[PDB]
Hints:
Strand content of chain C: 15-25%
CATH architecture of the largest domain in chain C: 3-Layer(aba) Sandwich
Radius of gyration of chain C: 21 Å
Bound molecules: guanosine-5'-triphosphate, guanosine-5'-diphosphate, magnesium ion
Order of helices and strands of chain C: EHEEEHEHEHEHEHHHEHEHEEHHH
Number of strands of chain C: 12
Number of strands of chain A: 12
Oligomer: part of a larger assembly
Number of domains of chain C: 2
Largest sheet of chain C: 10 strands, mixed
Number of helices of chain C: 13
Largest sheet of chain A: 10 strands, mixed
Distance between the termini of chain A: 45 Å
Largest interface: A-C, 38 and 39 residues
Strand order of the largest sheet of chain A: 5-4-1-6-7-8-9-12-10-11
CATH superfamily of the largest domain in chain C: Tubulin/FtsZ, GTPase domain
Order of helices and strands of chain A: EHEEEHEHHEHEHEHHHHEHEHEEHHH
CATH class of the largest domain in chain C: Alpha Beta
Distance between the termini of chain C: 43 Å
Number of helices of chain A: 15
Strand content of chain A: 15-25%
Amino acid sequence: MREVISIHVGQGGIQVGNACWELFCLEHGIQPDGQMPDDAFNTFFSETGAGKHVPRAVFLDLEPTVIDEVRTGTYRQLFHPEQLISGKEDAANNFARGHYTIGKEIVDLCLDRIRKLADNCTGLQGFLVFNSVGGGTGSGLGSLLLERLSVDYGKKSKLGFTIYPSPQVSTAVVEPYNSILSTHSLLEHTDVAVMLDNEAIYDICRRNLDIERPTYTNLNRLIAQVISSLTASLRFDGALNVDITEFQTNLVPYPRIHFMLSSYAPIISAEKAYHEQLSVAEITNSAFEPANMMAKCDPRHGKYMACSMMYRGDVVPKDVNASIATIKTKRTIQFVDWCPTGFKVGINYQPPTVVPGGDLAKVMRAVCMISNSTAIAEVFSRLDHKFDLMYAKRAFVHWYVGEGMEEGEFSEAREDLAALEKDYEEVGIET
Amino acid sequence: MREVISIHVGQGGIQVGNACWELFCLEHGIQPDGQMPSDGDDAFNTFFSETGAGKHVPRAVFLDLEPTVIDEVRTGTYRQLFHPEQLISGKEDAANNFARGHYTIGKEIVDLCLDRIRKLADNCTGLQGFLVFNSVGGGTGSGLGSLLLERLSVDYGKKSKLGFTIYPSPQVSTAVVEPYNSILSTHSLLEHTDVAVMLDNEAIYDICRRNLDIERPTYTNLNRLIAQVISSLTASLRFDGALNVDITEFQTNLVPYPRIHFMLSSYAPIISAEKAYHEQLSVAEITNSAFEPANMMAKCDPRHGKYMACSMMYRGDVVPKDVNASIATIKTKRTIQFVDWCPTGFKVGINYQPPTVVPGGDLAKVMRAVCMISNSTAIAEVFSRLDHKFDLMYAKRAFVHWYVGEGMEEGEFSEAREDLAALEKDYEEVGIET
Amino acid sequence: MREIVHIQGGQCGNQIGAKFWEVISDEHGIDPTGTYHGDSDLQLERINVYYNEATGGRYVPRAILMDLEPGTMDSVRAGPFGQLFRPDNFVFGQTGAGNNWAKGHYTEGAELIDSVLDVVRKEAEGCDCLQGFQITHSLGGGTGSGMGTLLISKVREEYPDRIMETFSVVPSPKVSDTVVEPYNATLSVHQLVENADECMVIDNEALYDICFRTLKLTTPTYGDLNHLVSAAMSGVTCCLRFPGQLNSDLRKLAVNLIPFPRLHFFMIGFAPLTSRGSQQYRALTVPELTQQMFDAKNMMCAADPRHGRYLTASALFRGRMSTKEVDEQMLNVQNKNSSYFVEWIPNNIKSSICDIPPKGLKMAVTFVGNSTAIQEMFKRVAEQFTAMFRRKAFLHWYTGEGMDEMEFTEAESNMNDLVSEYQQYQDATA
Amino acid sequence: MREIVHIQGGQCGNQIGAKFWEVISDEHGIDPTGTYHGDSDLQLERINVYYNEATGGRYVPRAILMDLEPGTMDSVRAGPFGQLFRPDNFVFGQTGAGNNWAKGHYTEGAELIDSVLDVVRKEAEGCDCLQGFQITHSLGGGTGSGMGTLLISKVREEYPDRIMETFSVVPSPKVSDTVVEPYNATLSVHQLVENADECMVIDNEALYDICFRTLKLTTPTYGDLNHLVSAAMSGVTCCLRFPGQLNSDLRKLAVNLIPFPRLHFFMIGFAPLTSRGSQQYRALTVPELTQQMFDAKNMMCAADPRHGRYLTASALFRGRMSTKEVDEQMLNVQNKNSSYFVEWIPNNIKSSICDIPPKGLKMAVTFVGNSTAIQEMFKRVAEQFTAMFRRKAFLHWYTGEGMDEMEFTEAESNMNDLVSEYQQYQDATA
Lengths: 431, 434, 430, 430
Ligand SMILES: Nc1nc2c(ncn2[C@@H]2O[C@H](COP(=O)(O)OP(=O)(O)OP(=O)(O)O)[C@@H](O)[C@H]2O)c(=O)[nH]1
Ligand SMILES: Nc1nc2c(ncn2[C@@H]2O[C@H](COP(=O)(O)OP(=O)(O)OP(=O)(O)O)[C@@H](O)[C@H]2O)c(=O)[nH]1
Ligand SMILES: Nc1nc2c(ncn2[C@@H]2O[C@H](COP(=O)(O)OP(=O)(O)O)[C@@H](O)[C@H]2O)c(=O)[nH]1
Ligand SMILES: Nc1nc2c(ncn2[C@@H]2O[C@H](COP(=O)(O)OP(=O)(O)O)[C@@H](O)[C@H]2O)c(=O)[nH]1
Ligand SMILES: [Mg+2]
Ligand SMILES: [Mg+2]
């Protein structure tokens, strides 16, 4: 009787959203048609009364090609026909269009579809939202939807899986603008944010997976695996179960600080997978390796606020405890002074699944960690510097002002980043 | 529950490592693909690591800045043994330039190499020490070797390190600049290695020609001898013996002073099957061939100096009482003389596993063998001639412009000369009588 | 959805458009009689963007052919794929402009503009959701420059929220085919800078160089020059008709490429172009594309892009490829050649990937770059304008149909002010 | 992956390259159509050093053919293995130099060389990790001697840390082909000593002597001379392409052979070389190979090494052999010829072993030696040059297009300084 609703807005969210659904359907044995050939599917799916199951998800976009691609793909018979919301005119990399010009006539239908799904559920745990942050409808609609849901539902937990721009590799030129404006919205309206920039995921594919030409198809499979590990405790019995509500109560020291970065292990191709044993003692070491961070950040430049790692497979409670004590012995990993213990550990029985046509090798153990560290202050600084250069000469500004946005909205957005950074510096200093 | 990690750097180090790993695999009975045949355990735990089901992985890492030799290993019959990501290769060779391998290129590989070393060491619980192989006359061998030792010292501390270096021969040589990079490498290793062994190439040629009756020895033949020496040295850790000797029972019995840890090697018997079975090869006579001066594996004559200490190992079916009589005979003999402040100068180890014979090799099968590692004051001559060569070269500053322009200052050569002179003075004042 | 109507004017525009409609039809598998004969279903998914459905199952392009004389439209109808055009869309007069901007914009332009604006209004009304307009014409001719820029203002006044394209062939002096080119070219740019949302400049001189140097073919003609331009036109909107990894419709291109409202003059290039005898010696991958992409001679303009600094540049890749290879290359180029790229904006290159390559090739790319070196175009033309206007030569014809010398001075000042502010950002330091 | 590109200049350079590429293709099993038809796997594992991959599974050499007159390259394009080269890489002038260093370095080189720099850049930095450049040319011809050395200068300026190698043909007066040889030879030597990392000297007189005496064939040809030169060139870089007991590349050879920065003029020789009638009367063994190697007549220069002292020597052995035998032979030679080896460089021979011999041979050796005897060539060339320059003969042709007598005086001064510095170490004692 526990349910979670997933929101996929923009092209970045939808394509990542698709990859999540081959994995969820494969775990529970649901065919693409939706008919099974006990009540563990209730977290994501819902019985129709006789036969098929429908996902508890809604796809939002304004540009039809990606949605029409789904509606004609192999999963045409899975999703409900009227929960794939498709528009006519794309936001076109403009935050003002998706928040002031387009989004005013879009949310009303969107909240109707959310309402219909929510009333069907009975034990709604929370919402999951996916959106690339450096885009028009990604941040323009995401900011509007999160604000609306904050007053419609109130205390429900909203988890955000965003994709921030890489330090030097990007596909857009105006993305430093619409990224900053989005921060002021999701800083005060999202309970949990995850750092999932693209450049770091490229490096993992090249080094660990032995892939020399990674593609967006490859990346979304990795992100889908993290989602499964995060919510594995809701639908699979285990020795130590952790609910969705048992993230904020253990990872958020203060309401302002809710930006964490994730890591996954092991990620090894089948060519050299079982050329080594993959013990439980070593997988927890690979999780803490700074190169395996899914975000382009260095944890060695700051302290650790709190750590939460989820184990799935055939691990046993003896070995995590032995491994964790080893980590505290390490000198290169240093925690903040006022937090003596900072690990929250969960253990599950269901091993990770393998998708046909994939890249990851099947293993009997895996670990996924969500770590809160002060080192994440670097990504805000580097994006802040990029915004300062362009806004110095008011480049690209006339595009935003013409779409109903005020001139001074940038100024109040810039101050929030400066306010946010000083919070991280203040927390890190020992007493 | 005892382990050891072996490091191979440079072409010569990789070549000798290939032979020694073939020898270890043959001795422990593992197929070249890593799978145990057919179907008494933990005999391989010293060198290998179980994957949990079937095959094994060696506790080694291969280093080089040029892929010509490395890619051979990934393609040969042993392509299934080594882990694919511990055979580390570069793109541009140091080209017999110490400066290139210590200041320009070597600083881009050392981080990855140390990461691999950590990934190997965190999976072991009783590491006695490190084994490092390198040829000193090459650029990357001297450069990356010195950088590796410098980083491992600070990163680990008191863990023992054993370096089986190969100094250039007195008159036989391959390169022309190799006197230069020997001095800097020696200065680097002096205060960073715990035990060093001298294995110059010219002596091994003489041993082969005289004993195995080979009139055209090749690098393949030499590597087998060094592999057998390593096997004899390390068999006491992984095989049951009557009088066991661990790795840590070398730095308590062989080096009287911290600065004096350069020592020679000798192996016996080395004999071919055509004349192996014409004598009984008793323990009484094999120990004489060990101390025979022309049988020393380094081109140094112990008759020109005193003996400091001697740690020597036996394997086969040797009996402890038989060893004592031979030691007494050697001490009675007058041609061999020890320092006065060392009344007892023998450390003897006895093991039960006979020396395994490699098929297609050169040595025959013998029930007994002895490996001798001695420390003596006679080693002072090898540095003096190399000092003279370096002085002759550096008198008018030849080949120096190939080192200055790669980051090394002019005065670096002067400091190493002072270190060598101080080292020679240290041997002289140690060897003087009271 | 998000469809666009095509309107072409003048002799040069009609020839450009006729070849363009031939290129599009082959991509969608449309026979010269308007009957679909394709093989893949993807060719029919987004056909409503360019084509209109008629009873009987045939497709008709939503193109409007406007000109002043029937001479050229006799030629376009007899050519291949000429049967597609609807006879109702042929709007034209009988007199002719005679390479006179005054005649093509004030006297004969006024009386014929009602008919052409009526048929345009009908087509824009019929479609579901309009995306914008694209226009092909020449700035040296009377009809193309005269009614061409006049129809811009009338359409913009009625559809202020839609986008507008102009594929303009500016007159180069090295190969000049009209003695009065500087006059009607200067007056057109003045009106074009105020209304057109995107302007793309083409040279006949540059296209001649490409044929002689890259393709290395013996006897090129206007049939081949039109082909190079037509390939670029279809590559810009390819992601609007086909699925892709990073689809980026035209509105997204305008936002990324235009820093300031008055700087919207781009230069186009296409790749890969190879000679027939040397097409089996090269390797076709992502790297070899971006080398030809950024080369100076591959551009379709006489202006040297290395004499100035790129403000922003864009690329559109067609085919199956890896995004990591594309993204690293754009960063990699921008780091080795940091001198040619303006400093006060970081990562000034945008990239897109479309999954359907052009027919006959496995990979292709279209490069659109807004460079500060385009100032050489206006400077050199303005020198010719001030030379002839000082002596009042050829001016009695223009003053004969209502214009006065005050307008000529106003136009020259606006262009001279355009270059001043366009070069101003070249030397700007961060 | 540590590959080396090829640039050939002048008629002599083109003739050298047209045979070198044939030799390399024969060695690596590449058909004249560019399709691999080899016999083992070792022939393809390091093929990337000299070749590039194109679509269709064919290989193309990474060579750049530059010259001033199209006759030579038209001749070499129609010959066997002439279809391998990419037709783009052909760059040619229209007028030629006419055996004039001034024309080849100032008046046509400046105009043409931009394109060849563009193609050299493209080929060089399209590689994974460049190893260096190698150039073939002659110092007796105007266009080669001038444009090639200007190319050397610009390439060295753009790539300061790469390896530069040149196979130079020095004109001899005994068999003279041009009356203006001393001028351009002196100028080329002056411009080359400052830039080139490695230089080797080849003499047609010595080639004729070898062909007449050792091979004992009645009528040698430029084909035969180019064949010997090609074998010598392949011998140096075989070790970079094939595995061996002791691997050693160009940088290692340069470091071990160059004592002082300005002493980089070597002489080479090859062994074994036996006539057809006496080919099997000999026995391929290391002592015979090394004695024929160190034979003074076998060297490819008229400079007799017995008139001076070897600073260093290098020997690259190809085949399977015993390193103990190789070292023993080297030591024996160095002890038996103590007079000809300068004493303050003990053990002054470098040795190498490569397991893959040349096709058709079981054992072969490439020798590179730096001996103090080459100063005789410099002295004789300087004497002829100063004899001609005393009376200002042929001076107006060189001075008519930019140069003055001051540069000739500077060239004489630098040439004499090189001679004095290089003979200084001949009599030096320890
Ligand atoms: N991880 C991942 N990121 C993607 C993918 N596709 C696009 N992105 C990111 O999305 C960013 C730009 O947004 P778009 O994907 O173009 O679409 P959008 O965010 O919905 O904004 P619009 O273009 O207005 O629709 C890029 O910088 C990419 O980093 C994807 O398939 N996987
Ligand atoms: N024992 C033994 N020594 C070797 C062998 N090969 C090379 N050496 C020694 O190595 C020295 C030169 O170094 P190399 O082995 O050629 O290569 P390196 O040490 O990696 O140095 P670089 O050539 O710069 O890469 C020589 O003086 C030899 O004494 C071998 O096969 N066996
Ligand atoms: N690309 C291309 N350009 C053309 C063609 N025909 C003419 N032109 C160019 O158009 C210019 C003259 O335009 P013009 O015919 O006067 O335009 P109009 O007065 O509106 O008909 C000349 O400079 C030509 O270079 C063609 O078929 N293709
Ligand atoms: N070894 C060799 N030398 C050649 C060949 N052809 C010409 N030469 C030499 O090159 C010199 C003339 O060079 P030249 O043709 O003027 O060179 P260019 O001016 O660069 O074209 C003569 O002295 C010849 O000895 C050849 O095929 N092989
Ligand atoms: Mg989009
Ligand atoms: Mg080496």
